């Protein structure tokens, strides 16, 4: 069981007849997935994992960059010294699950410890040929459409003492988020909004605040909106149906957790938290430094009904502790699903 790097390959259940661009890309870039993949539990062996130094993440990153290069073609791409022009037709866009697979001579160890924080020893290890299916959802602040924690909320970080290390909050219950650009009674084709059930979110940060306090005891735990910067990271940004949404989260990350109780202080209405969103055409790229420019949005109603399954938090540096939404490095998005896996060489 000697840890090792090697070129993984992706597998998917992509469908030959599907025009959706994830299917199209996986059709030529991945192999079909197995209906019954074998898994061999080993209750005896204990191996150490490290989700923050896992070469599987970097290989996934390169594939997703590569998928976006073939799929979401911008009208023009501006990178410092250059400007590339292409046809930018509108496209059908809906992420599908990708599995990562070890070539022969290597195996994938899977941690079965349902509260494993991503670092150190895992006592219950399995062997699989491929990971489970991971939807490559590119987003900031909120992790969408992932998998849930099995027991309690899990706090992951490379080092909770180092405030510059991103914190990944793995929820154990999804929180529904519905964003829509609706179909003069209309006035702007670039305005959208998201709805989140207030009590569901009140209960979430209550239990997230409980887990955070375990790590930062005797402190008031505050949630505050993003620090300033690029719009991609100061808002909850994500792609919906090919359109780039930027959703303001100031009413979302806005509460205090004192004396074991969470007190939401963001704005709310019919028991619902609303985020105002813009659809933007000029976006700052996450694949590399520069800008990409897209056509105006499609007609009709644009809706993404998603499941928040995790959060990206950052703690302010210095008698209190303040947490803001983070993200930006999509490697953390892949880490949040690949944490339990580790590629190993069967010498």
């Amino acid at each position, epitope marked *: 069981w000697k840890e090792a790097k090697t070129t993984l390959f992706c597998a998917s259940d992509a469908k030959a007849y599907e025009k959706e661009v994830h299917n199209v890309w996986a059709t030529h870039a991945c192999v079909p997935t197995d209906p019954n993949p074998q898994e061999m539990v080993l209750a005896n062996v204990t191996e150490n994992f490290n989700m923050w130094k896992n070469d599987m993440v970097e290989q996934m990153h390169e594939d997703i960059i590569s998928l976006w290069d073939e799929s979401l073609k911008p009208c023009v791409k501006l990178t410092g010294g250059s400007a590339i022009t292409q046809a930018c037709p509108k496209v059908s866009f809906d992420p599908i699950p990708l599995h990562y697979c070890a070539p022969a001579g290597f195996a994938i160890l899977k941690c079965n410890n349902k509260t494993f924080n991503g670092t150190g020893p895992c006592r219950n290890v399995s062997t699989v040929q491929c990971t489970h299916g991971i939807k490559p959802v590119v987003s900031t602040q909120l992790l969408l459409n992932g998998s849930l924690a099995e027991e309690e909320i899990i706090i992951r970080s490379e080092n909770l003492t180092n405030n510059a290390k991103t914190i990944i909050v793995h929820l154990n219950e999804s929180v529904n988020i519905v964003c829509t650009r609706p179909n003069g009674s209309g006035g702007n084709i670039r305005q959208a909004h998201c709805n989140i059930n207030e009590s569901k979110w009140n209960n979430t940060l209550q239990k997230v605040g409980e887990e955070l306090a375990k790590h930062f005891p005797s402190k008031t735990i505050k949630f505050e909106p993003s620090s300033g910067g*690029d719009l991609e990271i100061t808002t909850h940004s994500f792609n919906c149906r090919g359109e780039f949404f930027y959703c303001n989260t100031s009413d979302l990350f806005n509460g205090t957790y004192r004396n074991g109780t969470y007190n939401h202080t963001g704005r709310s209405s019919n028991g619902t938290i609303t985020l105002q969103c813009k659809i933007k055409q000029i976006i700052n790229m*996450w694949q590399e*430094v520069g800008r990409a420019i897209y056509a105006p949005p499609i007609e009709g109603e644009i809706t993404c009904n998603s499941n928040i399954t995790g959060l990206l938090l950052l703690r302010d540096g210095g008698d209190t502790e303040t947490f803001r939404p983070g993200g*930006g490095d999509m490697r953390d998005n892949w880490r949040s699903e690949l944490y339990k896996y580790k590629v190993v060489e069967i010498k």
Partner: nanobody
Amino acid sequence: EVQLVESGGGLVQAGGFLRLSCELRGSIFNQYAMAWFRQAPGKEREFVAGMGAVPHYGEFVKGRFTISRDNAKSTVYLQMSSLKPEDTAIYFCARSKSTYISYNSNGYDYWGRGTQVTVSS
């Protein structure tokens, strides 16, 4: 292994011009945004100027500073004009964790050693 080579700075007369530069080594430049923070004595490190896809400036800048990127030289530059005693501080180069700029110092995992800028009247 990542290192930031800082250049420029030191003593300026009030109203003068100064240039700061910072070469990123052991990392792919066009993968990371770069920024300058400053720390005056007794104060919190504060964001001055940063650039990934687009430049950002701290509120106290007021169009006096220009930040730019040189991909060929893996270097980012800060041109500071109309400097004032208020601008005296240790200036730190920083490499972002990503392609994006945050104003909060915790969006950065690599820091230069810091160079003193002193504006003398």
